[PDB]
Design a protein around this ligand. Sequence first.
Ligand SMILES: OC[C@H]1O[C@@H](O)[C@H](O)[C@@H](O)[C@@H]1O
Ligand SMILES: OC[C@H]1O[C@@H](O)[C@H](O)[C@@H](O)[C@@H]1O
Ligand SMILES: OC[C@H]1O[C@@H](O)[C@H](O)[C@@H](O)[C@@H]1O
Lengths: 447, 448, 448
Amino acid sequence: SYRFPEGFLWGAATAAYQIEGSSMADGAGESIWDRFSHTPGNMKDGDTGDVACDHYNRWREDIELMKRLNLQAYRFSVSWSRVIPQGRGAINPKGLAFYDRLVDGLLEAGIEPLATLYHWDLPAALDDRGGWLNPDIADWFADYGQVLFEKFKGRVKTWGTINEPWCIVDGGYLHGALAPGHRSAYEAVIAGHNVLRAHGAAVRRFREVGEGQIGIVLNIEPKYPASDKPEDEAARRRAEAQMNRWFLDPLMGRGYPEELTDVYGAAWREFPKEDFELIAEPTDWMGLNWYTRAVPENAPDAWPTRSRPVRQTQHAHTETGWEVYPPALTDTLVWLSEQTGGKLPLMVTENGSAWYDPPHAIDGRIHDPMRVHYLQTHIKALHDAIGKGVDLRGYMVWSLLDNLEWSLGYSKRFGIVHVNFATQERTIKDSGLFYAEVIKTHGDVLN
Amino acid sequence: RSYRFPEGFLWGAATAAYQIEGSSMADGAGESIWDRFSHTPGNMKDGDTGDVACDHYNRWREDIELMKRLNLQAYRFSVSWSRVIPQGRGAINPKGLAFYDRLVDGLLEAGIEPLATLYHWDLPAALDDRGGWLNPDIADWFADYGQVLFEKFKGRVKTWGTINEPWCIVDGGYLHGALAPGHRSAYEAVIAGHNVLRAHGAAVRRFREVGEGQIGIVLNIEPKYPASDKPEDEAARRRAEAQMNRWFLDPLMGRGYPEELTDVYGAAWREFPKEDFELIAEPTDWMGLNWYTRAVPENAPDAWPTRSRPVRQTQHAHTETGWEVYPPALTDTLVWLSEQTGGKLPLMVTENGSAWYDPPHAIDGRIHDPMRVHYLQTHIKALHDAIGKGVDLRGYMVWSLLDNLEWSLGYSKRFGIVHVNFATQERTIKDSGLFYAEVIKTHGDVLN
Amino acid sequence: RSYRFPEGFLWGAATAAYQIEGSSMADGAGESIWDRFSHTPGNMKDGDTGDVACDHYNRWREDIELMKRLNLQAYRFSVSWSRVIPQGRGAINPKGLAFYDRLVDGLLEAGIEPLATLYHWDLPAALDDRGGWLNPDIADWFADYGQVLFEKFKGRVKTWGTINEPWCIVDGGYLHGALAPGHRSAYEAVIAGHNVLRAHGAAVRRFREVGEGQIGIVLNIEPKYPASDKPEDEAARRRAEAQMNRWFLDPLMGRGYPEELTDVYGAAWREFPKEDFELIAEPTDWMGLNWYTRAVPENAPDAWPTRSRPVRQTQHAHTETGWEVYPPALTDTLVWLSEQTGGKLPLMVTENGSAWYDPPHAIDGRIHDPMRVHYLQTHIKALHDAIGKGVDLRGYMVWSLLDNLEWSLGYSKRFGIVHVNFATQERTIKDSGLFYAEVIKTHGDVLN
Ligand SMILES: OC[C@H]1O[C@@H](O)[C@H](O)[C@@H](O)[C@@H]1O
Ligand SMILES: OC[C@H]1O[C@@H](O)[C@H](O)[C@@H](O)[C@@H]1O
Ligand SMILES: OC[C@H]1O[C@@H](O)[C@H](O)[C@@H](O)[C@@H]1O
């Protein structure tokens, strides 16, 4: 049987810059992605988030779609620069009003709104003050958090602080593939620390003025052994430490992983103890974003982890080049349960896959059998995790809509709903239809 | 084409006491006319009785959990007169009243609106021994019975039905004898119909004196369509229509008895005192419609007493009870009823559903009943059309919540959206139930 | 002259939690502002506290038997917020809630209608440490508290009061400091009044979302009569009237705050956001009037802050609390109130009564209080007169069922129609209680 526990929450997820469009509309400020996406060479095919899914204007239709998919929850992000154009100071009434209407529309539809404070779109005005390199950001973020905490008190009960610190730092400051496009280990170390601090500050502020549950959202990519060679095991631990333990360990009060000292070398720093007290501020829940695993081997020229993944040719790969391997989800869920002591309620805040779909519907249909396969096998893997005692409270499919996959542009479709970006026409994919059955039957359809 | 229903539109399912409860004479419960009738050989298919039925008397909690799983907002049920007052008059049976007390509290705790029916065909045998519906004093007896309930559940049961389908009671019970008490007499039928109407009026008055909320009657209507252009067939149609659809509605609306009845019942027809019609026409707050099908009557000189017979409509599907599936006739009927009641009387579909064959046990935890699903979706759409035509329709109750005893046809006719394995009493939600749960959740939008 | 009251007119008696219960921090119960206030020297007459009071928390069953002896049809009581939610927010206290559960079931069993008040001056101290009525979040806090009750007693408590006497709470608690929490500030008074109104609105909205029945606020009114024809005295009268009788009623009726308040509070007066007034004016189902007396204000330049003072009306009797006895002013007030609410809002006298000296013990099993009897008969007659003048008055609650703690004035002021010997907790029904019982029994005919 695959019936899920009582109260288990099924939903789907999005992010502001990836779907909203209208980036400068109605008072909204400039974000780092406004700058980044309009700089030549940064984005595939020169794609930008200027229009995206036009969600800012078509959110009502999108909610009708959520209802057709039988969604019980919708996880979304709030654009900081849309709400506070300069990052600090005067609030933008219309910008806040958008999310106000959105949340009311969701509650009317019977859909639980899951809000994320930061999904990679820092206000440019704050980037001009150093962004995540400026320790004061811990306060800025907190204040920003407060604006929402008070505005949606009693309506938004489940809060995420930061979405994937590792992507923000590794993509934004270490390798520069993401906004703000810096490439520096020194900056990567500092930015990671201040992201954690910002999370802690926001949680404290939430304790003072908020109502409900708050937590961080981490992505994890489990690193499997390439061989029994010791240099490869050392490589595996470097990669695992840099990607999976960098943020989790200090969040659990265990400090930074020792291996980071080797990974970042002269760029590594010692931080004040009270910083770690702030960072480990107790949370109510944790989100896991999960897609795949990796099999790292030693790679002396790979900066900075000196490791590289070994291609697992025995399995299918997504268009983002990610191995399809459902058991590794179960394992990860087990592992995380151990790291949090079984004491912290967990939720899969993102899971999904990118495969090729045509740019238009084919007489009113999009047939994506591999996305369907991914969905069913990984959800079964969730059931396996719950059977092993992991406290899993919910599952959010990434993503509700085909959207802007950041620097990879619109070429990577993660949606269970197809978006024709020429016409903004939405078409429910076979995967969405199937997910609607999984929700409807509460998992029994997998039988 | 949208199918979202009006704000406050109430979704539910319906049952009746003798058809589901069992334990009919248990815990002080009195003997009813159906206790006698069902234990007389030849009266019931396969010799089925209501002795056990769905064992609801013991398993009502499980049944409430099933109501919650179906997202029901209302539960329409009947109270067994003989369970509450074993001799029909006099001493109350505490355990019997306590059952409905627990039931109603359990419903309210579940957030489900209790819709109570005073009389659903199970007259106490002690009152039948005093002439039953042939005795005018029943108008008082019924009222007194009603009072007991009105005061016991004051503030908890806000929506009350008096009589469920006067026509089935009289035509089946007194005219043709297919139902309890099994009499066959036009003379008795006329009197019984009249006293049922009077009893309804008396109950409404008593409700005005001691009750709280809304009270009304529940009528079944089977619209009669033309079979041909022959005038004798039209006369046949009007006879059938008068005897079945206008017999009770008309005096309830102050129009007296249909004149055609004079021809239908002949020497058995009677004139009744003028004040009786005043009692019968006591203003009500709402009316229930029980609806399943239509008929296409033609002339049949040897058919007693309406001299009519239905013509089989072979172009359409028929249920296990032989009823034509024809959803537009629901819409028409609702409109018609709205017109007969002047548009001023709030209406509710208190019964609608269909019987199809289901296996006696679930098959891998399931019952696949696609025809019942089809009936459900098309007729609910027909409700939407009726509302679009200005009918003041406030709710819809599916007959039935459970597979149960279909009276004289026994357990062979399954009307439930929840399957009952009568060997094990195990309940299994049918595909029709799952779909109805979807209709309620989306408030009709799933039909889009 | 007949004095028969309307059909359904509800007779009852009233109490408040801190005034009768005792056991204030017992069985998980939290600390309230009155726990703190009453145990600070100088605050209470004779150093009296609510530690024991009428020991009602332990003797509620005996008290219910007393209600039955008085023929009460209703019992108006308040729920201690800190007894149910010790810290004001967060965890519910099961034993505390269980007390009121038992109480309500016992009342319903006795055939007595429970009229519940959410807030009767006993704020949890933990919320006072967060600013109390000065903190806007209290509007939410109160609502959540309200929800706990609304759902716990859904279907059992059908009539709800939100706030008992905003004016006493703010004027006594924040303006002059004679009541808990003992602040003395016009600035704080203005803010507190605003947030009490907001809290009422929030509770009404929450009640619409999760509750069942009728909900309303309870206001005290002390009608201000002319002292002379001097214009400064009329200006004084209008200041006093605005500050006491119109401060809360007007925004509740959507008329905004009285203009005169700008003059009364001066630099302490504030403008509040417009949506607050949308919240404050949330439609209610009924309104309670607490009434005892009138005043005859004259100009008094040194009287802070209304610059007015009452003129002693020596032509009439005065109660032991120093209140003039003048029954016509009750009639007038009701009429006035009827006019202010447009006649559309059902009214109930939630408090009326008088304090006179009684001995601390019964005298051969009796307490002879002829002036309290007199007050009762004349003011009930005044109620009848008010109804004859078109006031939609549905009921009357005598303050109080029991001799109790008259807050800062302690046990020295006896308002009970039932005498309480505070040395022994013995209850003795006073002559006034006997007479009131006869008034209820005859539905007013005894006044003839
Ligand atoms: O790369 C696919 C997805 O990965 C997730 O971890 C990020 O939160 C999304 O913003 C992104 O679209
Ligand atoms: O014939 C099916 C159903 O018909 C309805 O009109 C009656 O009220 C039910 O008791 C019966 O089970
Ligand atoms: O001041 C005397 C009385 O005033 C009433 O309006 C309050 O509700 C009582 O608690 C108090 O005993």
